[PDB]
Structure 1
Amino acid sequence: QRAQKKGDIILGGLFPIHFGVADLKSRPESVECIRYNFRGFRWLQAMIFAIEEINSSPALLPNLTLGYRIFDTCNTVSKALEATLSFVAQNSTIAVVGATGSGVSTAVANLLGLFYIPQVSYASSSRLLSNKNQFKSFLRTIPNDEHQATAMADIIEYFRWNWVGTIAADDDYGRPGIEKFREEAEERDICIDFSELISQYSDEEEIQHVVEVIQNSTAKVIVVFSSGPDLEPLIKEIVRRNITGKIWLASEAWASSSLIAMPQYFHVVGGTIGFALKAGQIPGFREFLKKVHPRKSVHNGFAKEFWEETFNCENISSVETPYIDYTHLRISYNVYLAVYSIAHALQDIYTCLPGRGLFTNGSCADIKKVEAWQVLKHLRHLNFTNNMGEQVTFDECGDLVGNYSIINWHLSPEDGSIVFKEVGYYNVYAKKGERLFINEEKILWSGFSREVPFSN
C-alpha cells in the first residue's frame, strides 16, 4: 500500500497510518500493523492536498508537475527503514517528509544523511536531532522539546509546587526531554519525588511496578513525556486501579491524543493541562477530506483500509472518527508548510539568475536535472512566508519555533466527550520569565475542583 503519483519531481512521505505492528522456527515472514491511526491518515491527506494545490498553482513551479511516493511507517523503524531503502534505491526522491517519531526519524535521518537527501520532519521534536554533525540533511517544521521542558518547569513554579513526579517513554521523545526538565527543575528548586520510564510494549509487571511507584508517592503533580501508544498501557491499569486526584502535565505528544483522552478514563485523566502547537489554517482541506472514497482517488491505495476501518467493511461524516472530527489543524498544518518549504526551495532553483547562485561561481542549479543536495542547500537558506501570514525560515539546526497553547481537558455535558479548552499561552519568541501566561480561571483541577491542588 503506497500513495503514489507520477511527477517530474518526486517527494517521499512517511506517516504513522497505524500505531504498531503485531522465535525463528521459520523465515521471519515480516510483520503486520494491528491498529489503524486516524488523523495519521488525515496527515498524508494534507501532503497530497498540498501537492495537488501546488500543481494547480501556475505561479508556484510553472510547466512542472510534482509526483509523490508515500508509504506507512506504522510507528515502526523496521517498516520505516524498508521504505527509506526504497527511497535511495537509485542513489529519485528529491525530498522525503520526515517521520513523526523521534526514534523512527533518527534512523531514517542516518540513511538519508548519507546521500544528503533533504528530510523535513513534521512532528519529530527530539533535541538529539539538532546534531547537524550526524543529522546533516535533517530539517524539522516543529519546535524541539527544549522549549517545552522549560515551559513545564515554569508552570510547576507558577503554581508554587516543589514535589512532582516524572514518567517518560523509554525512547528519544521522552528520556532526552525529561533530562532537560530535570535540569529545568532543581534550578527552580522543584524536587522530583520519582522518575519512571514506560514503553508501548512494557511487560504487565513493569506496568504494575510503575503504577505502584505512581502510588506510595505523596507527589500529586506528575509530569509525563510520552506519545499516546506508550502511555496507553499505563493509564489503562491506573483506571482499573482507579487512582484519582493525581494531576498530570501532558507533553504535547499525548496532550491531544484520543488514545488517552477518552470519557471512560476521564475519572483519572480528567483536568490534564498539556501543551499544543499553534493551530494552523489549511483552506479548502475539509472538502478534500470528505472527497475521499475507495475505487476513487486510486493513487491513495491507503483509502481501502481507511474505508474498511471507518465503515466496518456511505458518507464519511456519518461515522464519527478523529479523521474529520477536528477543531484545530496543528501537525496537519506542519505537514502543509513542510511540503510548501520544499516547493519554494525548488521554485528558487527554477528562478536563480546566473552569477547569483548559492552554488560555486554564483552558478544556479538546472531544475531540469535538480539534485537532492542542491535542494538541501536552498532549504538551508529558505526565507518565504506562510499562508497564515508568517515568515518561515529554518534555523542553523534546521528548526523553526512557535508559541505553544496551554490546554486543559474538560467534560462536555452535551455529549459527555472530553473538550480541550485553551487556558493560556507560552510565547517562545518572548523573554525569560515573561513567556508563560496561564489564566488561573478555566482550570478544572483534577477535572472538576477549581482550587490549586497541594503538591509539597
Structure 2
Amino acid sequence: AQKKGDIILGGLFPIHFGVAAKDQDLKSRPESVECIRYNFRGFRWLQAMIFAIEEINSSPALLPNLTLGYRIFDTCNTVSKALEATLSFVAQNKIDSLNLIPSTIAVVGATGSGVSTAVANLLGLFYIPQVSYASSSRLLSNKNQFKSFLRTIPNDEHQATAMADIIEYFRWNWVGTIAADDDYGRPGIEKFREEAEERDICIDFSELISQYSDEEEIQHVVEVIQNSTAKVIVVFSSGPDLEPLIKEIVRRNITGKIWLASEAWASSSLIAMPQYFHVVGGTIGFALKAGQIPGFREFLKKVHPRKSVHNGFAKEFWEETFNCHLQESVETPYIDYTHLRISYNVYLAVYSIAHALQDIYTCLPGRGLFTNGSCADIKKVEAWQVLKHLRHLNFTNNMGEQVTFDECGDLVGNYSIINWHLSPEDGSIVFKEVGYYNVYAKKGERLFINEEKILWSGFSREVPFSNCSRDCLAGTRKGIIEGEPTCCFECVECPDGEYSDETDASACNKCPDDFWSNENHTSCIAKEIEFLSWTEPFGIALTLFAVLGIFLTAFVLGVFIKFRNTPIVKATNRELSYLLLFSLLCCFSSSLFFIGEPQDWTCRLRQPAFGISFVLCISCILVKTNRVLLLNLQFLLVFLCTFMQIVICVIWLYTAPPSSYRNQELEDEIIFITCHEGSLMALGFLIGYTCLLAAICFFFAFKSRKLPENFNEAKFITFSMLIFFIVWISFIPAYASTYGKFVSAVEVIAILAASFGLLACIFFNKIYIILFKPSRNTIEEVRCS
C-alpha cells in the first residue's frame, strides 16, 4: 500500500496471523516465507488508517497545502516479517551518512509487544518517532533503553494497581488468582501480588492457564475453583486463553462466583458467548473507552478490489473473504463489530501526528520551541523536530476530551468499568457501563463507583461475603492465628473469667470484685453476699427462741427472790442460786453474736463471751454440792475459776485478734462473710478448759448418785453434765457437715440446746415444788432434806 505525497508516514499492521513454519534444509537458495491465517480485524484496522489519511487531506482547516501519503506493510505478527519492512523505512533517512526520494517521518507502530520491541530498537537510532496502537508491555515504557516510543494505550500495570482499589471499595479479603501461561499474565500477577500484600490483601490460590495445557490440569484447576471458598477470582489472560476453560467450568455448572477481569478479555467476544448464558453473568471488567467515528461504516462498505488500486490487500481480501478468484455484505467479523476499541486508537494516533505537524507549521518566528527561539522549517522537516513537538501535545479530538502524552509516553485516560447485564430483547452477553477510573490523579479520587446499577450473581443485588473467616459474634474474641495467613482467624469463646461485648474484640476484659459474669460472657452482674440474715425468717425464729429462754430465766429469778428464808430456798446457799441465775441470764444472750452480717468487733469478742459464761456457770454449779466444798470460799473459788479463763481471753484478744474476712474462695457467685480465727491454740484453750471443768464436776457428781439431799440434786447434776457432753459431742459432726450460712445456725442451735439443757435439769423440779398444787407438803423446814 503506497500513495505519493509530500510527507510520508510508515505503517505496520498484522494482516495475517501467522507464518507457515517450514524446516529450511538450505540445499537450494532460501526462499521467502509464507503467511497462512487471514485476519479480518486487522484489515478493518488498516481501513481505519486509510480513512484517517483521506480525512486530513480532504480538510483545509488542518495541514493545508501539504498532501500526506502512506506506506503500509503487513507484519505477519513475526519479527522476521517486520524488520524486512523496517529496513525499507530506515534507508533514505540516513543511509548516505551511514555508508561511506521520500523519507519516513513517523511510524504507526506494531501490535504485538515483541514486534514493537524489535522495531523500536532499530528506530531509536535515527530518532524517527513511533506511536503504538496496541502494545501494552511494561518494558516499552523505559525512556532510557528506548529513546522514542509513544503509546495510545495505557500501561497494563496500572490495571493491577487499579484492581486492588475495587476490592477496597467493597471491603473484602479472600480472593483467588488465575493467570495465563504467557508473557502477558506474569507481569500482571506479579504486580498484583505486590499491591495486594502492600494493601494487606490475602490471596488463596494461584493458577496458570494455557491453550497448550492438558485436560487433566484443567480438571485440577476446576477442582481448585470448586473446592475453595472464595467469591472473587482475578483473571489476567488473553481472549483465546479461556475458550476451553470457561466451557469446562460450565460443564461443572458452578454458579456462585463473581469474577474480575483484565483488560484483554473484559470486552472479548471470544470469552462471552450466549451459550455462557448466566453462569458468567454478573462480572466486572476493565474495558477501553469507545467513541464513534462518522462515515467509517460507509467507508468500509465502499471498498472493492479493482476499483481502488492503492490498497494492495483488496485483491486478496476479495478472494479469501468470500471464496472467489480473479484474473488480474455477509457474515464476517469485518463488518460485524459492535465496539470500536482499537480502531479508534489508530484513528486517534493519526490525528496525534497531524496536530504535531500543525504545531510545527504555525509556531511564531519569535518564540519557537527550540534553541535560541527558532522554529523548524516545514518544507525541510526532519524527524527529531517532530519528536520534540510531539512530546508537547495538547488538543481537542472531536469527541471532546483533552489528550496530552505523559512524561513516560503513555496516554492519560479513563479505563471504563463495565458490568454484563443480559439485555431482555437480545438474550446474550451485553455490556453496561458502571464506573470510571483515573490513573494520573492522586490516590483517593481515582475510582468512583455507583453501586445501585451493578448486579452480582446475575439477578442478585446484595454484596457478597468473602472474608477468610466470618467475623466472630459478640461474646467471643478474634482468637489466635490458625496457621493460615494473617487475614484469617478463628473464633474462640471467652472464658467464664471475663466478658465480651464489643464485636470483633481481640481479648476479653475483667470487672470488679463481687462482680462476676453471667453466662454468654455478657457483662459482670453483682455476686451474692450470703450471710445468716434477720431478713430470712429462720434468724428471727432463732431470736425468738433466744428471747423465750431469757423470759423463763427471769421467771426463775422472780420466784427465787420472792421466797427467802423459806424451806426450799433456805437449805441451799442464798447467794449461790443468785449467782447461778445470772450465769443462765448471760449465757442465753451470748448466742446472739452469731446472727447477722459479721462486723469485725462482733467477730472479735464472740468467743470470750461463750468462754466466760460457761466457765462461771460450770464453776458455780461445781461449787454447789456442799459435800466436797466445806469468807465465802465457794465465791472465792468461783472468782478464781472465772479469772483463770478471763486471763486467757484477755491475752488472746491482745496478741492476735480474730479477723472478719469476705472469703470469696468458696464460690464465684456466692461469697461467704466469715471470720478467720487468729491463733488456733487461743481458741483451743477456751474450747478445752470448759470441757475439763465439766468433766471434773461430772466426776464429783456421779460419785454420790444414790444419796438423797435436797431432792436428788446430784442425779440432776449428773443429768446436766450428760446433756452438756451430749450436745457438745453432737455439734462437731454437724459442724463438719454444714455448709456456709448454716454453720452459724448450727452454732446457735447448739448453744440454745445446751442453754435449756443446763436450765431445766437444775431448777424445773424445784419450780414445781414451789408452784404446783402440793407446794405446802413440799416445803417443811425439818423435812424435805
TM-score > 0.5, shorter chain as reference:
yes
Inter-partner Cα distance in structure 1 for 2:200 and 2:457: 24
Stretch of structure 1 that moved more, 190-199 or 401-410: 190-199
User: Structure 1: how far apart are the matches of 2:126 and 2:210?
Assistant: 32
- C-alpha distance in 2, partners of 1:315/1:390? 46
Q: In terms of mean alpha carbon deviation, does 363-372 or 139-148 score higher?
A: 363-372
Q: Which moved more, 1:261-270 or 1:154-163?
A: 261-270
For residue 425 of structure 1, report the CA deviation from its aligned partner. 2.0
Q: Deviations over 1:50-100 (max 9, x none)?
A: 11110112232222111112233344444334433333243x321111223
Q: Which moved more, 1:343-352 or 1:439-448?
A: 439-448
Check whether the contact 1:129–1:138 (CA below 8 A) recurs between aligned residues.
yes
Change (3 A) 1:111 1:211: farther
Structure 1 position 116, deviation (Å): 1.7
Displacement of 1:315: 19
Evaluate the alpha carbon distance shift between residue 154 and residue 355 of structure 1 in structure 2; reply closer, same or farther with a 3 A threshold. Answer: same
Native 8 Å contact 1:350 1:367 kept in 2: yes
Change (3 A) 1:309 1:349: same
- For residues 330-387 of structure 1, the C-alpha deviation after alignment (integer angstroms, 9 at most, x for no partner) is 3222211211111122222333444534333433333323222222111112222222
- TM-score using structure 1 length: 0.85
Q: Give the structure 2 partner of residue 274 of structure 1.
A: 285
CA contact (8 A) 2:319 2:326 kept: no
How much has 1:227 moved relative to structure 2? 2.7
Q: Residue deviations 1:207-242, cap 9 Å, x none?
A: 666556555544342212223234445445545565
Distance in structure 1 (CA, Å) of the matches to 2:353 and 2:4: 17
- Does 2:139 match 1:139? no
Is the alpha carbon distance of 1:303 and 1:163 closer, same or farther for their aligned partners in structure 2, counting shifts above 3 Å?
farther
Larger Rg: 2
CA distance in 2, matches of 1:214, 1:36: 36
Q: CA deviation at 1:172?
A: 4.9
TM-aligned CA deviation for residue 138 of structure 1: 0.2
Q: Whole-Å Cα distance in 2 between the matches of residues 359 and 222 of structure 1?
A: 52
Q: Which runs of 5+ in 1 are unaligned?
A: none
Distance 1:203 1:353, change over 3 A: farther
Change (3 A) 1:95 1:214: farther
Instruction: Give me the whole-angstrom Cα distance separating, in 2, the residues matched to 1:89 and 1:312.
Output: 38
CA distance in 2, matches of 1:270, 1:30: 47
Counterpart of 2:369 (choices 358, 361, 364) is 358
What TM-score comes out, normalization by structure 2 length? 0.52
Does the CA-based 8 Å contact 2:403-2:412 persist in structure 1? no
Do 2:319 and 2:325's aligned partners in 1 also have CA atoms closer than 8 Å?
Answer: no
**8 Å contact kept, 1:310–1:316:** no
Question: CA 1:355 to 1:12, structure 2 compared with 1: closer, same or farther past 3 Å?
Answer: same
Secondary structure in 1 matching 2:406: coil
Q: Aligned-pair distance for 1:12?
A: 1.8
Q: Is the 8 A contact 1:125 1:173 kept in 2?
A: no
CA displacement 1:89-126 (0-9 Å, x = unmatched): 43x32111122333332222222223222010122233
- 1:139 Cα shift? 0.5
Distance in 1, Cα, partners of 2:374 & 2:200: 56
In structure 1, how many angstroms separate the alpha carbons of the residues matched to 2:68 and 2:116? 24
Aligned to 1:82: 84
Query: C-alpha distance in 2, partners of 1:449/1:126?
Result: 37
- List per-residue Cα deviations over 1:135-188 (Å, max 9, x = no partner): 211011222223321222122233333222223345554322332222221233
Change (3 A) 1:381 1:46: same
Separation (CA, whole Å) in 2 of partners of 1:255 and 1:221: 15
Counterpart-to-counterpart distance in 2, 1:38 and 1:240: 31
Q: Deviations over 1:375-421 (max 9, x none)?
A: 21111122222222233221111112111211123334434332111
Between the two structures, name the one with larger relative contact order (CA 8 Å, sep ≥ 6).
1
2-side partners of 1:314 and 1:415: how far apart? 37
Q: CA deviation at 1:426?
A: 2.0
Q: 1:31 to 1:193 in 2, by over 3 A?
A: farther
- SS of structure 1 residue aligned to 2:131: strand
Distance 1:254 1:237, change over 3 A: same
Instruction: State how far apart, in whole Å, the 2-side matches of 1:404 and 1:246 are.
Output: 24
Percentage of pairs with the same residue: 99
Change over 3 Å in CA distance of 1:333–1:369 after alignment to 2: same
Contact 2:16 2:39 in 1 (8 A): yes
Could you tell me how far apart the structure 1 residues matched to 2:284 and 2:265 are? Answer: 11
Q: Deviations over 1:275-332 (max 9, x none)?
A: 1222223222222122222223332233344445553549999424443334443322
Q: In terms of mean alpha carbon deviation, does 425-434 or 43-52 score higher?
A: 425-434
Taking the aligned partners of 1:237 and 1:113, their CA distance within structure 2 comes to: 46
Measured in 2, the distance between the counterparts of 1:102 and 1:6 equals: 30
More strand by share: 1
1: CA distance between counterparts of 2:121 and 2:222? 36
Say if 1:103 and 1:172, in contact at 8 Å, map to a contact too.
no
Alignment CA distance shift 1:448-1:378 (3 Å): same
* Change over 3 Å in CA distance of 1:69–1:246 after alignment to 2: farther
Total equivalences in the alignment = 449
Equivalent pair of 2:157/2:187 in contact (CA under 8 Å):
no
Q: CA deviation at 1:6?
A: 2.1
Q: CA offset at residue 274 of structure 1?
A: 0.8
CA gap of 1:76–1:412, structure 2 versus 1, over 3 A, is farther
> Quick one: distance in 1 between partners of 2:145 and 2:280?
38
